[PDB]
Symmetry: C2
Subunit: 229 residues, 2 copies
Amino acid sequence: MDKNELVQKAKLAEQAERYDDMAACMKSVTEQGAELSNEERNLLSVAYKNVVGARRSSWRVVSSIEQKTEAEKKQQMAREYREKIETELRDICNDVLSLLEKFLIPNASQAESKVFYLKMKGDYYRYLAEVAAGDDKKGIVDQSQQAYQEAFEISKKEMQPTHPIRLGLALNFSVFYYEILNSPEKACSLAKTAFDEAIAELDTLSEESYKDSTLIMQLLRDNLTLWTS
Amino acid sequence: MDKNELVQKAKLAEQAERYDDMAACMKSVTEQGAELSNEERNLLSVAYKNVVGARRSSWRVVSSIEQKTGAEKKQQMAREYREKIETELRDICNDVLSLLEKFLIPNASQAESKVFYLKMKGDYYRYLAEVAAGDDKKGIVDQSQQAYQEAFEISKKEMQPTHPIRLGLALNFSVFYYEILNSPEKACSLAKTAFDEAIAELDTLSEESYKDSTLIMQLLRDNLTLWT
Ligand SMILES: [Ca+2]
Ligand SMILES: [Ca+2]
Ligand SMILES: [Cl-]
Ligand SMILES: [Cl-]
Ligand SMILES: [Cl-]
Ligand SMILES: [Cl-]
């Protein structure tokens, strides 16, 4: 289990759409203690997004089936299956959050890295919050918001408005306001100013990042249109 | 634990796209030893299709990367990952095949079901063949051919040419000839006669099953024009 070997295996697993393997590879890479490159960071991020994503997708289907059933035998099955999916989901989120606290955030030598990992921390507490019961929830929601907020402040100070990480943070942070806090108003103003400040930046883009930035801008505006129908 | 409870859990799993769970539920329903209903047969089939298919899809990507490279370190990674994927795939195929042999084929009391399960046996031996490389291959290819052939004999005798299972068998058997046995002429002949016989007997088409039948006919002809 060499660093290059594990990264190469992670890229193979990605092409094979075998995301558990991919996450396992990048988990052990992260655990070697060294600061991840841009490439590795993205591989870790993509792997766990897919690993949690599958459970989040399943959770929403099973949860909706539980809510649409009017007897006790069928509901208790949907309920028990939701709870099985929930524990898998929490195990995965806590894996990622542990990696973030122990290795990734401490070793982040640049503002880019810092913001990226703090956004990631916000995301995985937000996924725990989607699934929270209510007592633990308020504490989960505050962790998410603190992570996003610290990231938001570093991004404003240290990155241009058209930077894909800054735009991506705005998108996710706005989704957090809408879906976790239930504030359409805060979600809209966050998304709007991110879009408008990016539109205003004149030739701030570069040949590498322009495709991702303009795509996230489109996703910001899509949310604005949806949220004021 | 209860048959109906396992089937309901399988339907939940399907909606959740959690196909290993779906496959586990329907496997244990099969193991209870009673002849499966049509709904249960289809749930088993869909479940394992997706379980084995993910491995097949992964296998093809990792084979393609192995072939498209000549770096010594990178080729050895791909090969060992292909082999990991292959033993997963073989274990899935062997679970399905043992269910077919022990429970599904012996209990099938209608020609429709017998043809379905023999076709299924053909399919899963074919998936073993796709991965077979050693001297094991000829034996596996033969196993696949005999299952398909027995299914073919029964369907021809007992089922109408428009019946979706008859048509479905013709599609899969033609694919076997083309992809496993490298025999495009036999593949085209099988597909063409199945298409033509169905066209000739459009009188004997059911309102419940015509959509499936005409879709499969379209696939048979798509292969004819592709293979031409
Ligand atoms: Ca997987
Ligand atoms: Ca699964
Ligand atoms: Cl995997
Ligand atoms: Cl996966
Ligand atoms: Cl599953
Ligand atoms: Cl699955």
